[PDB]
Amino acid sequence: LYRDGGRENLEAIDFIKKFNETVYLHFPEAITIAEESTAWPGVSAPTYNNGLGFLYKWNMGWMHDTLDYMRRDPVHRKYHHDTLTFSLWYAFSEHYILPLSHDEVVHGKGSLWTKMPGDDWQKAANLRLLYGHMWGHPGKKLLFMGGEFGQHHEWNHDTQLEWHLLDQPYHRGIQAWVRDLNHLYRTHPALWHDGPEGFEWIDFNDRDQSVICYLRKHTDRLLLFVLNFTPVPREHYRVGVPIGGPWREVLNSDAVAYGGSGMGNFGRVEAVPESWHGRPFHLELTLPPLAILILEPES
Amino acid sequence: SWLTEEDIRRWESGTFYDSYRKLGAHPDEEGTWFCVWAPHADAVSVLGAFNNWDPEAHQLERYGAGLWAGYVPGALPGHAYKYRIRHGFYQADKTDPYAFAMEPPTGSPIEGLASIITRLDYTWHDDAWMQRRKGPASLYEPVSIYEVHLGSWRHKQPGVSFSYREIAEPLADYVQDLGFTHVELLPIMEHPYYGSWGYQVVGYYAPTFRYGTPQDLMYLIDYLHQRGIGVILDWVPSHFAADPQGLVYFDGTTLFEYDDPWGTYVFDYNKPGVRNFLISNALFWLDYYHVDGLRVDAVASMLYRDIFGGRENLEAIDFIKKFNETVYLHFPEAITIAEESTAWPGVSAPTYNNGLGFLYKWNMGWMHDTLDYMRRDPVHRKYHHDTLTFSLWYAFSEHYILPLSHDEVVHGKGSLWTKMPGDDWQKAANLRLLYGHMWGHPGKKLLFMGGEFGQHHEWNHDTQLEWHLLDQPYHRGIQAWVRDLNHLYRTHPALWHDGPEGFEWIDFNDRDQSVICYLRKHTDRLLLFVLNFTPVPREHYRVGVPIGGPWREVLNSDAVAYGGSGMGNFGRVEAVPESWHGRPFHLELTLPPLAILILEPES
Amino acid sequence: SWLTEEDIRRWESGTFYDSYRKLGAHPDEEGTWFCVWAPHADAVSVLGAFNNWDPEAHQLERYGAGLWAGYVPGALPGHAYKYRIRHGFYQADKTDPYAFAMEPPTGSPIEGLASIITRLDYTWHDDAWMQRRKGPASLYEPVSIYEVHLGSWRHKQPGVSFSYREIAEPLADYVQDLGFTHVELLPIMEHPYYGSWGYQVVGYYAPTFRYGTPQDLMYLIDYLHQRGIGVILDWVPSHFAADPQGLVYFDGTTLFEYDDPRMRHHPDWGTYVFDYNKPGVRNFLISNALFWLDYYHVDGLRVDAVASMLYRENLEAIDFIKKFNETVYLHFPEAITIAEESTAWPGVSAPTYNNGLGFLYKWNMGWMHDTLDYMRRDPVHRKYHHDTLTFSLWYAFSEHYILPLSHDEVVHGKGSLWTKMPGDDWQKAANLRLLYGHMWGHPGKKLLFMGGEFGQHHEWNHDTQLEWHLLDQPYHRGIQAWVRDLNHLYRTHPALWHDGPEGFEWIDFNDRDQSVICYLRKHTDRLLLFVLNFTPVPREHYRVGVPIGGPWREVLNSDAVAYGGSGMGNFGRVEAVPESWHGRPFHLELTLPPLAILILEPE
């Protein structure tokens, strides 16, 4: 896009547009995705809207900010709460694919696992938490090889991935957590719509306790996300909800099946009809350490 | 009151056979009723999310002798709950013995199992099957049972069992194609240890979570019934699992256990309360789950215990007798089966004749003898001929089910296929013969998963059967042989009557060539069985017969469709009006290698 | 007011294809709006419990285009209503043509159906189905339709049909077990005479009360979609029901019927044909097609007796038909329209711009008539009518055809499909499997009506449920098993998806004496070989030329014992012989079983 008259290469800008126009004309069901780390607008927008004509754009903003927040020690995550929450002001500017890629695990940048702070259990917890947020956050999902076990070293192409790590519990567990995350994504239509209608804020000001609650909805369907970014478990935590009635937790990052502490809400979580976070009802939940809770109303 | 004075009167009497209607957790629109049996308890409390696990929020009130009852508003279906029982200085958390559903809070059963408030509403579509089932009349009907472990049978993905729902349609299609009449399910009752196969039971009133919700199991049974298949459930009244959390020392003292010093996990049949819960669970499965049958295992462990000096546990014998009486009174068309490995007389006999009151008894003697005979090599079968012939002597003391089961295909005993001697063709031949004689032999039929195709590997609950073996021809042929056996069984009534009526010997004295001929006959109809237990083919072998004329070859084990050499008698054999085996006529037949021949007079 | 100037403009044009947005009864929490089209009425009023059934309480106001509108406070959902129309000297009570639900207030089996204020609100969960649903592209995908009458299919109790909800889980379970892709439901629109089967329609916009409320039906379709089954609706634009309060003489004059006295006379119906000249009729009918695809998420519409529409030539009907199909696919690009036309009217399945009628599919009745006629004959005589079987292929590519076996063909003394076939029971079942085998092999999509899949003896009786009790017998479960396996083959092997002339090759047709047929079904590399013996005499060493040499496997054999057959076949692998036959380089030397179809695949 930029050679650096103007800095823009219009040759390239017309080439990119005529590229996308030709592809979608000859193959109407193909997909073109672009990685652009400048903030060039309307990358994912149609050429007739003056866009470049890609269908998808990698959300490099989301990843950089998100990764930067995850890297910081939880004691400090208090002071960067605005970094995590503000990612969604930009989550709808393009059709976005949240992306974790080879580029983030090379040249001393470190494995996603290595990127995570704390002791070994905490690294798996933080890494499990991130993936939970990547799937809950609006946008499609991309994950590079080896991140699904949380492999230790940066991606080395001259060799094989660390498959031996699949025997140790923490790593076979992150793989299990991703498998179920993809299953939830595939089955629940509340996650298919990455538009603003598809996302609602529940609460964002628990900045001392570093807790974040948001909702992903399509029509009747609701999915509730509560994120504990600190190793402190939180008890008797109330979270506002749109509808009352029985709620069940469909996913708990801290479940033992994933290698977690094993706290969570086992029995039916029934809504309490007291207003919370500006919502008619609320759930009083237990938030496990460094864990993501996904909840569905019962049908 | 939650409990009527009649309700307490029958609990004390041991006549409360509806006790599931009142004990346990019973949902109401604003709250759940809780009812517990705890005679030596000083206090009982219900703990749950509905009270922030507060022990003083909802203390139970004793409503009668050893029963505690109370209502909790805000406890709703799907909540997990708990009993806190206080024995003086000490209190402990316990599961509901009458829990209708349980789920593991950890996600793994072996670390913990918790009671769930449950509603058992289900709309059934099996009315047509219900009226149709024979029950006691089944003795004169064909009873072929496929024994199953639901988790072990088929996996959707490696290491993941089929749901109650997911299994329904594959199993139903499978069972009809091979022609079995019932499925017998290894204990589905909630159990902590999967490796127990369900025989160490903690939740007698709860179907195991491993396969889904209670209604899911209800759907499966409903599904199978519409398809015309019956369901027999394995039931374990002999002993209970060892769980600190469940059953054992319920009040902090002995309750389901014997007060007197699987020892200590045995039910105290003396207590009226213990028989109440046990016989109600029996009726419970027939009532709420429309179950067609119950099979009680290790009955001898109940009958015996190892001035009076008596090894027979007379408590248990009356429990068994009153168990069986109660079932058939409330369910005249149920089926009760017992496995008792002692020669206890009249297991299958009615109580009024001093029998235990079962409808069917496993012919484990037959299974032992037959199997021991067929592992021996045909060269040696000459020398063990009496083990084959002697089985008939004891074939009529009980109404019997010939049984091949998981018990015989585990723990280094080897697959049924593995048991048979010789090379692969002979192994398939031997197994085809075993089933052939087993179907011809008097008694109902039971076969466990994987035996029907002759699986190589021992049955592993952590694994799914080697269905890939169905690509090999011999395994497919054994499956077809069994399919064809059940078709003949279902159609020819000469096999329906397992009494001395239906069996006549043709010849048992061919020890050198190890051949046996016998007859199966109800009224006019007769079926001829000729068995060659040696791989050496027999030519111009004469077998005496009652009727003359053309005889038909109804089944030939050695047919190529089953994987055999194809030696046979080509359809029609003509009977010769010459005497043989003390019979007026005889058929001169060709006996294929290691094969069973079924022949019919022509009609 | 209620009607905007645009709304009256479109109605006069004949362009109001969403007219239900404004016509009929539309509830508001305070009161209900009423809008009815009656241009030749001097007065029109709404009557209901909400005004003591007094005609002068609420007289609708005449707007433009003969449209009447009025609001009634206190009219609420579930209230019953009727229109009182005055034509000069005479007045009459009439039903709402746009009624969203009709109900008998009486509950009586014979009763007036009364329009009821209804709310159509419903939240759908069939997201995945509709986003991946494919209409016109299904031409190159397998389409297997199970045709159903909801009341006749299964009974919850004797004489009691299943609800839209109650049937949902049983019907979806059954269809999945047999592998059909879509269900075609005989007209569910409100009809007075249950015996009409739905073809006499009074409430085109109202689902029939017999099976429940509108939301129940929406749920049924929703459920079926989640289960991966498509729902095709039978739709009846050719004629409306004769009921005195219905569409007949609505405003006191001709409205939906032809104004002209002469062109009213019609042989099929007469007097009750729709006047396609009128924009209002075109509005009512075309909106209704879109109404069902929109509000009920319907996948397809099938129009019967199109020949009654095309001829009296009725240009207006044909332009209606053309604009119907054009409009449908304009609003729903993945919808499906099917036509049955009992003339050889060309280009039914052809696009409007090619001078076609614009349906995607046409019922292949030529195929149906010939095949049944051929198979009605005894195998001895089929020798003399060989051309009837083979010549179907001269006509198999004129349209996109759905080979059809329907309720029409198994009623009124035409005999059940089972009844139609000759010989003893084994032979009838053998022949029925061969007919099903050939229908699946023959080019075209597939439709089978309830009861054919098990070969029910008795003709379809709408007052009863199918003879499911026949599923106990071997022949009937086998035919059902054979249909399941045919459908499994259909869904997986793409050689059968392309019904174009490229997709079919003749291998042989001149075996008239032995009445054998070999034909080939191909897509690109993929091949399927069909060998059919229409006589009970088996043929051995039969050589059949093949395009490709090498190993061939027999994927399906109608004569397999699992299907109820004698069990003859070509065991496992078949190797092509490099010697020419049927003008082909290689050939397979096969054994052809009695009355059987072999389906063979290269390895």
Side-chain angles (χ1 to χ4, degrees), chain A residues 1-6 8-70 73-171 173-196 198-216 218-265 267-273 275-299, chain B residues 1-4 6-11 13-28 31-60 63-110 112-131 135-244 246-259 261-307 309-310 313-374 376-471 473-475 477-524 526-551 553-603, chain C residues 1-4 7-8 10-29 31-110 112-118 120-259 261 265-382 384-501 503-539 541-552 554-572 574-603:
Chain A
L1 286 164
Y2 287 112
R3 316 164 197 273
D4 92 285
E8 310 88 87
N9 182 310
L10 325 190
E11 311 128 64
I13 291 164
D14 307 327
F15 172 85
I16 303 178
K17 301 207 197 187
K18 179 79 164 201
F19 161 76
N20 286 305
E21 285 160 343
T22 323
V23 155
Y24 284 122
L25 182 134
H26 288 68
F27 302 80
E29 324 280 328
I31 290 126
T32 71
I33 312 106
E35 188 284 323
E36 214 268 310
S37 304
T38 279
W40 188 281
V43 188
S44 89
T47 55
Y48 62 82
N49 271 357
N50 201 26
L52 297 167
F54 292 90
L55 175 62
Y56 284 122
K57 178 180 169 146
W58 277 16
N59 198 323
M60 305 276 319
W62 169 89
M63 170 270 291
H64 282 156
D65 292 337
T66 280
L67 274 175
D68 195 40
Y69 175 84
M70 289 315 282
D73 257 60
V75 202
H76 300 340
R77 280 168 185 174
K78 194 196 284 115
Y79 302 109
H80 305 110
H81 203 69
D82 270 30
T83 286
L84 171 82
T85 54
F86 269 170
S87 155
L88 292 123
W89 289 114
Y90 325 98
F92 310 94
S93 50
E94 327 256 357
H95 312 309
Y96 267 129
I97 299 191
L98 314 176
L100 292 194
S101 88
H102 62 284
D103 304 292
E104 290 334 286
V105 300
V106 284
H107 313 341
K109 261 200 269 225
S111 180
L112 298 164
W113 174 276
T114 312
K115 285 178 213 317
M116 289 311 142
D119 86 353
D120 266 8
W121 175 97
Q122 296 180 353
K123 276 158 158 287
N126 293 278
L127 203 80
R128 278 193 302 262
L129 175 55
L130 171 85
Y131 291 169
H133 193 51
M134 187 207 315
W135 264 257
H137 200 252
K140 321 302 193 199
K141 336 289 181 192
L142 188 143
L143 188 66
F144 187 57
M145 313 184 324
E148 78 271 12
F149 334 119
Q151 88 152 47
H152 295 159
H153 335 277
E154 320 197 323
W155 162 55
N156 180 9
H157 71 279
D158 310 319
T159 200
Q160 213 193 195
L161 284 184
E162 287 180 318
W163 304 95
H164 71 90
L165 282 196
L166 269 190
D167 310 317
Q168 323 183 359
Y170 288 172
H171 303 306
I174 286 94
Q175 166 191 74
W177 177 234
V178 168
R179 182 190 298 115
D180 290 335
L181 276 180
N182 271 341
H183 188 79
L184 181 74
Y185 193 33
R186 304 254 251 166
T187 68
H188 289 65
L191 297 178
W192 305 356
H193 300 250
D194 302 302
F199 174 96
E200 241 170 47
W201 264 134
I202 287 279
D203 180 52
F204 39 83
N205 303 87
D206 197 2
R207 84 160 66 217
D208 193 326
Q209 298 203 304
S210 295
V211 189
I212 165 62
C213 315
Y214 59 80
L215 200 92
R216 293 270 259 120
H218 180 53
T219 67
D220 213 57
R221 272 62 57 84
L222 305 199
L223 265 180
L224 162 51
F225 291 83
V226 196
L227 290 84
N228 181 18
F229 280 102
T230 61
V232 199
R234 307 305 183 177
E235 270 188 332
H236 295 165
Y237 201 109
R238 319 168 176 235
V239 156
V241 287
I243 50 159
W247 292 64
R248 214 127 190 200
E249 73 160 37
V250 297
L251 275 183
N252 173 28
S253 152
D254 195 38
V256 317
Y258 312 129
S261 152
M263 311 162 91
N265 311 286
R268 154 201 178 138
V269 178
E270 158 76 23
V272 187
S275 185
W276 211 257
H277 303 145
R279 301 299 187 169
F281 317 82
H282 82 83
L283 321 180
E284 155 208 301
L285 288 182
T286 289
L287 308 182
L290 306 159
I292 151 84
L293 281 193
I294 324 197
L295 295 106
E296 209 181 352
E298 300 199 271
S299 64
Chain B
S1 309
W2 175 244
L3 285 173
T4 87
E6 210 216 16
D7 276 335
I8 299 101
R9 217 207 44 223
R10 318 179 27 211
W11 184 262
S13 326
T15 293
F16 203 163
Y17 295 135
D18 307 340
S19 50
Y20 52 77
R21 84 184 195 102
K22 273 306 180 151
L23 284 116
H26 296 274
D28 138 289
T32 300
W33 275 107
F34 287 96
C35 189
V36 198
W37 183 45
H40 319 101
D42 313 321
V44 180
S45 316
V46 180
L47 276 57
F50 41 86
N51 54 32
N52 205 260
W53 313 90
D54 210 318
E56 280 140 11
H58 311 283
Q59 307 114 313
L60 282 217
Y63 275 35
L67 295 199
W68 307 72
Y71 179 89
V72 185
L76 305 126
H79 265 125
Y81 67 95
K82 206 173 25 183
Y83 289 140
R84 178 98 101 216
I85 296 115
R86 167 162 157 268
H87 203 30
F89 196 81
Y90 302 87
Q91 328 147 343
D93 282 351
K94 287 320 214 132
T95 80
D96 201 325
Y98 277 85
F100 296 162
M102 312 198 333
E103 291 179 16
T106 105
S108 68
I110 316 98
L113 260 167
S115 320
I116 321 285
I117 296 175
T118 320
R119 264 203 229 255
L120 291 185
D121 305 279
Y122 188 80
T123 286
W124 291 84
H125 328 96
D126 59 335
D127 306 9
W129 159 264
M130 291 319 265
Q131 342 284 318
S138 76
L139 293 164
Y140 312 109
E141 323 249 10
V143 183
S144 215
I145 324 165
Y146 183 51
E147 205 196 16
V148 154
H149 194 286
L150 288 190
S152 321
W153 187 55
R154 300 222 215 197
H155 287 174
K156 307 202 331 218
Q157 179 195 340
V160 159
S161 158
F162 272 103
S163 174
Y164 284 124
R165 301 209 182 252
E166 292 172 338
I167 209 175
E169 184 221 76
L171 185 63
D173 296 1
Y174 192 85
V175 162
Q176 328 207 27
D177 228 306
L178 287 74
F180 289 108
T181 68
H182 301 264
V183 287
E184 203 184 276
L185 286 209
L186 264 70
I188 63 195
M189 304 98 204
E190 194 50 273
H191 44 290
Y193 185 33
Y194 190 73
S196 74
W197 308 334
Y199 288 97
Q200 319 293 323
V201 184
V202 78
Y204 285 75
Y205 289 89
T208 194
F209 74 102
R210 310 190 164 62
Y211 313 124
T213 278
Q215 275 88 352
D216 303 354
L217 165 67
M218 272 165 182
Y219 164 87
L220 164 46
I221 296 184
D222 200 345
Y223 190 102
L224 287 176
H225 275 177
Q226 268 146 210
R227 301 301 269 281
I229 313 149
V231 182
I232 300 171
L233 287 197
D234 263 348
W235 193 56
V236 187
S238 42
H239 66 283
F240 46 88
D243 217 43
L247 263 243
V248 185
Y249 289 113
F250 204 61
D251 316 278
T253 169
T254 40
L255 192 49
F256 301 85
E257 315 113 293
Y258 275 91
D259 300 337
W262 23 67
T264 318
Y265 296 124
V266 189
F267 289 90
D268 192 0
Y269 315 94
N270 295 275
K271 310 206 169 69
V274 164
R275 321 192 273 292
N276 260 337
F277 159 91
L278 270 191
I279 309 192
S280 312
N281 193 232
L283 299 170
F284 169 77
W285 291 114
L286 315 175
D287 187 31
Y288 270 100
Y289 295 84
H290 296 216
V291 174
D292 300 302
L294 308 171
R295 199 211 44 126
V296 181
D297 43 284
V299 178
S301 77
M302 281 155 87
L303 291 182
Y304 310 84
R305 307 193 211 238
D306 213 6
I307 191 172
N313 173 302
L314 168 63
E315 311 106 88
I317 308 190
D318 297 37
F319 163 70
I320 302 171
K321 290 171 176 238
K322 244 270 177 201
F323 146 68
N324 276 304
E325 275 158 0
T326 308
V327 158
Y328 292 119
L329 176 65
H330 292 74
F331 299 91
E333 253 69 62
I335 284 153
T336 72
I337 304 135
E339 173 272 317
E340 204 266 337
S341 273
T342 283
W344 188 279
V347 181
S348 75
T351 67
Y352 58 73
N353 287 2
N354 204 22
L356 299 206
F358 293 90
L359 184 56
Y360 286 105
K361 170 191 168 295
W362 279 24
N363 199 352
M364 286 263 285
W366 169 87
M367 169 299 284
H368 285 122
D369 289 339
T370 323
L371 288 195
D372 168 15
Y373 178 71
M374 304 264 316
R376 286 153 197 279
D377 321 330
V379 303
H380 298 124
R381 285 180 190 190
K382 322 174 214 318
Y383 312 105
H384 304 100
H385 201 71
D386 272 347
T387 311
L388 177 71
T389 65
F390 271 40
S391 68
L392 271 319
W393 289 122
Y394 317 93
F396 310 91
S397 44
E398 321 266 16
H399 310 130
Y400 274 127
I401 303 187
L402 280 357
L404 289 178
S405 125
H406 56 296
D407 310 322
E408 299 323 321
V409 151
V410 294
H411 300 155
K413 287 197 278 224
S415 142
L416 281 187
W417 163 288
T418 303
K419 281 168 203 292
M420 304 283 125
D423 54 311
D424 297 351
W425 184 96
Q426 289 188 20
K427 287 178 135 55
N430 273 299
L431 206 65
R432 267 189 313 263
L433 187 52
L434 165 66
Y435 295 146
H437 181 60
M438 177 179 142
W439 259 255
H441 187 288
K444 308 314 185 190
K445 337 272 184 215
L446 180 121
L447 196 52
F448 183 57
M449 336 178 309
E452 74 268 28
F453 44 106
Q455 161 159 309
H456 301 123
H457 228 305
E458 277 181 22
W459 169 61
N460 187 294
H461 58 313
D462 297 314
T463 294
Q464 157 204 30
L465 306 161
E466 332 184 289
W467 298 101
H468 67 85
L469 290 182
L470 279 197
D471 309 328
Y474 286 151
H475 304 293
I478 299 161
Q479 224 214 17
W481 174 241
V482 179
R483 177 219 327 268
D484 273 11
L485 275 199
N486 274 342
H487 181 79
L488 170 86
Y489 183 32
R490 280 198 189 207
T491 40
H492 288 62
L495 313 168
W496 300 356
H497 291 84
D498 306 293
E501 337 314 332
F503 178 98
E504 179 169 345
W505 271 117
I506 296 299
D507 199 351
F508 53 89
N509 276 307
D510 200 342
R511 337 173 82 80
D512 221 42
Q513 336 194 311
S514 267
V515 179
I516 53 144
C517 324
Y518 57 96
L519 223 42
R520 284 264 251 137
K521 334 94 54 68
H522 178 235
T523 69
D524 42 298
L526 63 127
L527 263 187
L528 166 79
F529 296 73
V530 177
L531 291 89
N532 187 10
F533 282 94
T534 196
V536 174
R538 292 325 183 174
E539 208 121 355
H540 309 307
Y541 190 127
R542 306 179 150 168
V543 164
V545 303
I547 319 188
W551 281 59
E553 212 172 59
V554 181
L555 282 185
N556 184 335
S557 162
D558 198 62
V560 284
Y562 312 121
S565 150
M567 296 184 7
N569 299 264
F570 316 120
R572 254 209 186 138
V573 56
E574 205 70 39
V576 193
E578 212 162 292
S579 275
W580 213 257
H581 296 143
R583 304 295 167 141
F585 315 77
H586 78 254
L587 318 162
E588 160 169 330
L589 312 162
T590 285
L591 313 173
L594 291 168
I596 150 91
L597 281 174
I598 292 115
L599 287 84
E600 216 185 10
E602 251 185 18
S603 154
Chain C
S1 87
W2 180 241
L3 291 168
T4 41
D7 290 334
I8 295 147
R10 292 182 49 174
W11 186 272
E12 212 100 61
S13 325
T15 294
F16 207 154
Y17 301 147
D18 45 322
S19 44
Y20 44 89
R21 262 196 310 119
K22 285 274 141 158
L23 274 93
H26 291 89
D28 147 50
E29 339 264 346
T32 301
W33 275 105
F34 292 98
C35 192
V36 45
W37 176 55
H40 302 114
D42 318 309
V44 177
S45 320
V46 192
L47 275 60
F50 46 71
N51 56 36
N52 198 8
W53 304 93
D54 165 22
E56 282 197 27
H58 301 109
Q59 294 138 291
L60 316 179
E61 184 176 333
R62 185 63 139 282
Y63 297 13
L67 298 159
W68 299 81
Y71 185 90
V72 167
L76 304 136
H79 265 174
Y81 71 103
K82 55 156 67 171
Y83 294 123
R84 163 77 47 92
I85 305 178
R86 163 167 86 71
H87 187 200
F89 196 83
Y90 295 84
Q91 305 178 25
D93 286 337
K94 305 235 90 198
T95 207
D96 196 320
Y98 278 92
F100 290 163
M102 299 177 86
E103 212 191 34
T106 54
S108 147
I110 151 237
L113 263 17
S115 324
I116 287 259
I117 293 150
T118 301
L120 282 203
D121 331 338
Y122 177 84
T123 292
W124 291 89
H125 304 132
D126 61 343
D127 303 70
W129 170 270
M130 321 278 304
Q131 289 168 28
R132 299 137 198 200
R133 153 167 108 168
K134 282 252 175 293
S138 69
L139 266 173
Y140 317 117
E141 268 166 348
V143 175
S144 193
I145 303 134
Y146 186 68
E147 194 192 13
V148 163
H149 193 268
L150 288 183
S152 328
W153 182 67
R154 217 147 72 94
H155 270 206
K156 170 183 28 150
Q157 283 132 5
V160 189
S161 319
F162 279 109
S163 156
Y164 292 119
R165 308 200 162 249
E166 292 160 349
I167 207 166
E169 191 202 61
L171 191 55
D173 274 311
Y174 190 71
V175 155
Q176 164 210 316
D177 205 15
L178 282 95
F180 292 94
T181 76
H182 298 76
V183 279
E184 203 187 88
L185 307 173
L186 271 54
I188 53 96
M189 300 96 205
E190 199 56 86
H191 38 300
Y193 185 29
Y194 188 71
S196 79
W197 311 332
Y199 297 100
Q200 312 280 120
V201 161
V202 56
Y204 280 97
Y205 286 80
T208 182
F209 69 102
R210 319 171 157 87
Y211 314 137
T213 73
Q215 281 81 355
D216 291 353
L217 172 67
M218 304 177 185
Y219 166 86
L220 167 73
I221 294 141
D222 194 337
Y223 186 84
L224 293 177
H225 280 162
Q226 311 190 47
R227 300 293 293 279
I229 304 132
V231 189
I232 294 171
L233 283 206
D234 273 355
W235 187 51
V236 196
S238 38
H239 78 282
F240 63 101
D243 273 39
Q245 78 295 324
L247 297 129
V248 198
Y249 281 98
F250 195 87
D251 39 5
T253 86
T254 51
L255 191 63
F256 297 86
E257 42 258 272
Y258 279 85
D259 290 351
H265 313 301
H266 187 275
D268 303 274
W269 334 103
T271 325
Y272 300 120
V273 191
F274 284 104
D275 192 349
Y276 311 109
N277 299 311
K278 283 175 199 109
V281 166
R282 261 178 293 128
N283 271 324
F284 170 88
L285 275 178
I286 289 187
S287 320
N288 188 253
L290 298 185
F291 169 91
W292 289 108
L293 299 176
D294 170 27
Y295 270 41
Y296 286 82
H297 291 214
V298 173
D299 299 281
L301 297 163
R302 173 201 144 291
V303 173
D304 47 284
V306 183
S308 76
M309 280 149 97
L310 311 160
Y311 305 91
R312 292 182 325 174
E313 302 109 9
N314 208 224
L315 284 341
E316 12 148 343
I318 308 167
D319 276 328
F320 168 74
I321 292 149
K322 266 148 163 210
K323 193 132 188 25
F324 153 75
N325 280 306
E326 287 159 351
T327 314
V328 166
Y329 289 118
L330 168 72
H331 286 80
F332 301 81
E334 299 310 316
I336 291 196
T337 33
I338 319 156
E340 173 263 306
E341 206 265 332
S342 274
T343 282
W345 185 283
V348 184
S349 90
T352 44
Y353 52 72
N354 278 170
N355 213 5
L357 291 158
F359 297 81
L360 183 70
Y361 288 116
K362 173 187 161 142
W363 274 20
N364 199 341
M365 317 281 313
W367 177 87
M368 175 278 287
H369 287 125
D370 297 339
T371 325
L372 287 194
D373 191 66
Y374 175 63
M375 310 261 306
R376 258 197 185 192
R377 280 130 162 80
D378 312 49
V380 177
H381 301 93
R382 310 193 160 153
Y384 311 131
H385 301 69
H386 198 68
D387 283 345
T388 305
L389 172 64
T390 59
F391 270 47
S392 92
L393 279 304
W394 291 120
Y395 310 99
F397 312 101
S398 152
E399 317 248 20
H400 303 139
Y401 284 120
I402 302 191
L403 308 182
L405 287 187
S406 83
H407 54 292
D408 327 278
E409 288 323 294
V410 296
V411 302
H412 302 134
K414 292 186 228 216
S416 93
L417 290 166
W418 171 273
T419 308
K420 280 170 210 262
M421 325 268 297
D424 52 45
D425 294 345
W426 184 99
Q427 283 179 318
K428 329 193 37 150
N431 275 297
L432 205 75
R433 289 189 308 256
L434 177 67
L435 151 82
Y436 288 172
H438 183 50
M439 154 180 26
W440 258 258
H442 188 290
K445 309 306 176 207
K446 322 316 195 257
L447 192 150
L448 190 40
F449 181 69
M450 41 183 31
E453 71 275 21
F454 50 102
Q456 159 170 328
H457 285 80
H458 164 53
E459 279 189 358
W460 172 55
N461 178 206
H462 68 87
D463 285 328
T464 324
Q465 77 165 14
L466 298 166
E467 322 185 302
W468 298 102
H469 61 96
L470 300 205
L471 267 168
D472 284 35
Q473 324 231 15
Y475 293 156
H476 302 271
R477 154 188 92 208
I479 295 163
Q480 168 189 263
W482 170 245
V483 170
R484 157 204 292 123
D485 288 346
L486 284 173
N487 263 344
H488 185 65
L489 188 91
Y490 190 35
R491 313 258 293 243
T492 86
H493 283 97
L496 306 150
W497 304 357
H498 300 256
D499 310 316
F504 176 87
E505 282 212 9
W506 270 121
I507 308 186
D508 184 48
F509 36 81
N510 320 123
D511 204 353
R512 316 172 88 81
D513 266 288
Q514 298 173 310
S515 271
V516 178
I517 279 287
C518 308
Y519 59 82
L520 201 69
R521 205 83 135 77
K522 61 207 292 306
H523 184 44
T524 63
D525 228 349
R526 269 63 52 87
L527 264 154
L528 264 182
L529 168 62
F530 295 79
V531 186
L532 288 86
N533 178 15
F534 287 72
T535 75
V537 174
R539 274 77 178 63
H541 316 302
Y542 202 104
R543 331 219 172 261
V544 181
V546 292
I548 220 66
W552 282 69
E554 168 182 63
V555 302
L556 284 177
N557 178 333
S558 96
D559 191 51
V561 168
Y563 305 115
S566 65
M568 333 180 163
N570 296 261
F571 242 28
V574 183
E575 209 88 16
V577 175
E579 149 188 356
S580 191
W581 211 273
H582 288 110
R584 311 260 181 192
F586 310 78
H587 73 276
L588 323 166
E589 175 201 330
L590 298 147
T591 284
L592 324 182
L595 297 171
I597 190 192
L598 295 89
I599 311 187
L600 269 72
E601 181 148 69
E603 168 157 324

